[PDB]
Amino acid sequence: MSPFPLTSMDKAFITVLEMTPVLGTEIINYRDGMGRVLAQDVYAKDNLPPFPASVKDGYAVRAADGPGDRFIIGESQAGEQPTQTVMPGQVMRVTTGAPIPCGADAVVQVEDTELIRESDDGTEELEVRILVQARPGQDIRPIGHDIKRGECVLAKGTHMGPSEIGLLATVGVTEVEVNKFPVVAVMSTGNELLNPEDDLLPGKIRDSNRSTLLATIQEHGYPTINLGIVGDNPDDLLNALNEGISRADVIITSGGVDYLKQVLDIDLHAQIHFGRVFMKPGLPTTFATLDIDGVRKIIFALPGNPVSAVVTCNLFVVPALRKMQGILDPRPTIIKARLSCDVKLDPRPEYHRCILTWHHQEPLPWAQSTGNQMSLMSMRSANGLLMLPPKTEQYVELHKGEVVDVMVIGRL
């Protein structure tokens, strides 16, 4: 039959993960933190708040002194620190958020005070009459309420969102250790391809996949390396693969495929882990690893059919790139959804681009298949791709309403 054994869908996936490395670490400015994984634990260097803050607007007070006629030492306002220490009979005006001065038990809110004597000049307010015997600690959020010095705030292996950068800033950790993003090189094989810019010539078509693929990986925000179009010939083919390995960590080839496989397995001395896979679409999908000075590069050779190119990429490349940046569970989000059209099941497992839609106030999402015919004219780009099972001695046709697996592939 074929050159290569037909690999199980699951086994193919499980292979790609297991074979894929995990990249090294790197120090980056927290602002560049977005979408990265912490290769360090992060502890607070100081307490948040750093100071007994007021919580209400009023007067800082040694509660022990109880309600009385008190001389207002000075104002405390949130911008700058305290200064003057408060002994018996003294008080200092605070405003919500200002540091509580040294020697003050608590704050009384202004409503519980009556302003007695002003100054002999118009200027200021000197005495105030505290009307409340106040529970010590009243309306002060103390050092550390929010974060305490030396506590762990972000665990090693965290995949950072904006809210995490928030933290990173708060705590004042400005450079973190993070696994590096894999730079990915993509190229397209075939003598029949022209750069979309060109007016089509006889025998030829435009190079579709390269654009899709670069864009598909960039949506995840990995770095791209455009290797252009390369002919279906061992020389120019190798030449590229070489630039590839030299410049990036993952090489992606989109080129309806022997000639290719031969170059990896003999000229490059790469190890093809699988060459054919039991799935629709993308039967001829090819995974491969190559170790240059113990630095394992990874090599996907995906089919040419522009739909398969997308589908497999999301099934294999992406999960692998995730694993690579040190994501802990790179397996793709798969949600349950109700079918929006009847579908004929295939001997092999099918994967169809679809659009997930949570229709007003009821529980499961509808998945309408933009599938394949001509290229389902939406306004919104395919949200997820539909995971149809292999046809069994029971079910051979899934019906509108039945609840199917959908792997997510874009901001749902």
Place this chain on the structure above:
Amino acid sequence: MSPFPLTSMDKAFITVLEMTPVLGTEIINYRDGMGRVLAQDVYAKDNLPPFPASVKDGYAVRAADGPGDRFIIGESQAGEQPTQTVMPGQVMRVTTGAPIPCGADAVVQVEDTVRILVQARPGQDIRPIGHDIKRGECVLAKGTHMGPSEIGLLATVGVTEVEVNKFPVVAVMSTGNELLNPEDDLLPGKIRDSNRSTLLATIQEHGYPTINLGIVGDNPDDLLNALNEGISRADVIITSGGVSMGEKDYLKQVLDIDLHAQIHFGRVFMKPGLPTTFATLDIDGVRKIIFALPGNPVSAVVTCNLFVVPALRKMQGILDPRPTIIKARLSCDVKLDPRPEYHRCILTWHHQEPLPWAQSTGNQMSSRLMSMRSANGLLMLPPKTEQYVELHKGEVVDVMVIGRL
């Protein structure tokens, strides 16, 4: 009650959308297409495939010639259109995607072969010219939000520069005399400036251009001078600076008086983010938008995702900028509030159960629960009812999505 009427949650939202413009168009190279909306229809320039292509690879054959052993006059390989012309009694070698040679009717499979194992049927595995896309057919409708798959299309068709609504450049600042740059060593009485980082990150996650306006003090002079650079440089200004009591006006005063802006709402019945502030400003036709969000770094994220984002989407000409709201089972019991609560949480679809579980990340300060997953969506708790006091683990609630779920 303050100088401002308390605006309904829904009214506040529907206001921000209604008040927000939609930006002009722009011509961009299809490679920069990612995440954009088409301000043009896009039509096929030529058929595709432009030639009858081979579904299988073997031998291009005449139907009227039928079975038997025949002599070959050459090859057809993917790349080039054949010179040689098939005449009655001949045959040509092919490849999957190789053009069918001027004279051939159909093609032959694999273990079905110049030796010929035959049972003829015309049109046998040939991709007919214009079968996927016909010259002049519309392939992408005006208003489409472009995914990778769409760029694919754009490429296929050969359209390389498209008209698309422009992304809005968003300027972000933080007000307060109590803030330092997270770099700078914590001086006394100062906290670090947390929000600006989070907000710039939150909007870049969507891939809009940012303009970092830095820390600006709680004083009308420097306050306006910022807002100015803002309007001059960007299309949306975001302000993160706790403006609730005593001096809530300081900022509002500047828009209302110096800028002659129109505050559409100044407080909103929601937890968190009561003091949230929308605003518009028209300077020579151009309508600028201004959010003034509270200082509580949790609020700052929550509101931003509830207002700024929906508005930014509408602005890039997204058709339905309303955020995806999915149903999810609660993971912990929750005490409902008089006002509607929004809690960052983490959606998880467990290995078969149809609904996803949602667990909160925190209320205030930093985070209650620690995780390696990042805030997936944020949880939409309802106001507490004459009948309803608390929601229990398992109950099925609304969750607005806020990141690659």
Place this chain on the structure above:
Amino acid sequence: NAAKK
């Protein structure tokens, strides 16, 4: 549970 959104 009560909606709200």
